[PDB]
């Protein structure tokens, strides 16, 4: 399915994913487009911080829905 990842910098990217994809897996695809290391990414959906080892289906993330990407640096 297609999902969207919003950076609060203003911009958005599309991602191509499966419901069984892990957040880890999503982070890797974000790094491929944005260059941000996975341990400096945090993803937010429906007011929850998403865990690395869990899947999109675990969080009821559906086609054309949107995740929010936040930086955790120092």
Domain definitions of the chain by residue range: 1-74
Give the method used. Answer: X-ray
Q: What is the dihedral of CA 25, 17, 3, 13, to 10 degrees?
A: 60
- Dihedral sign of CA atoms 44, 37, 72, 10 in order: negative
Indicate the burial class of 68 (C-beta count within 10 angstroms; 0-12, 13-18, 19 or more). middle
Contact in structure between 13 and 26 (CB atoms under 8 Å): no
User: In terms of Cα–Cα distance, which of 52, 47, 1 is closest to 22?
Assistant: 52
What are the contacts of 6-12 at 24+ separation with CB within 8 A? Answer: 6/66, 6/67, 6/68, 6/69, 7/34, 7/68, 7/69, 8/68, 8/69, 8/70, 12/66
Across the beta sheet with 41-45, what order do the strands follow?
A: 12-16, 2-7, 66-71, 41-45, 48-49
Q: How far is CA 38 from the centre of its chain?
A: 10
- Report the relative pairing of strands 2-7 and 12-16 from DSSP bridges: antiparallel
């Amino acid at each position: 399915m297609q999902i969207f990842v919003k950076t609060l910098t203003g911009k958005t990217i599309t991602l191509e994913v499966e419901p069984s994809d892990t957040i880890e897996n999503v982070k890797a695809k974000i790094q491929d487009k944005e260059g941000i290391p996975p341990d400096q990414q945090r993803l937010i959906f429906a007011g929850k911080q998403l865990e690395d080892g869990r899947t999109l289906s675990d969080y009821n993330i559906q086609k054309e829905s949107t995740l929010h990407l936040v930086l955790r640096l120092r």
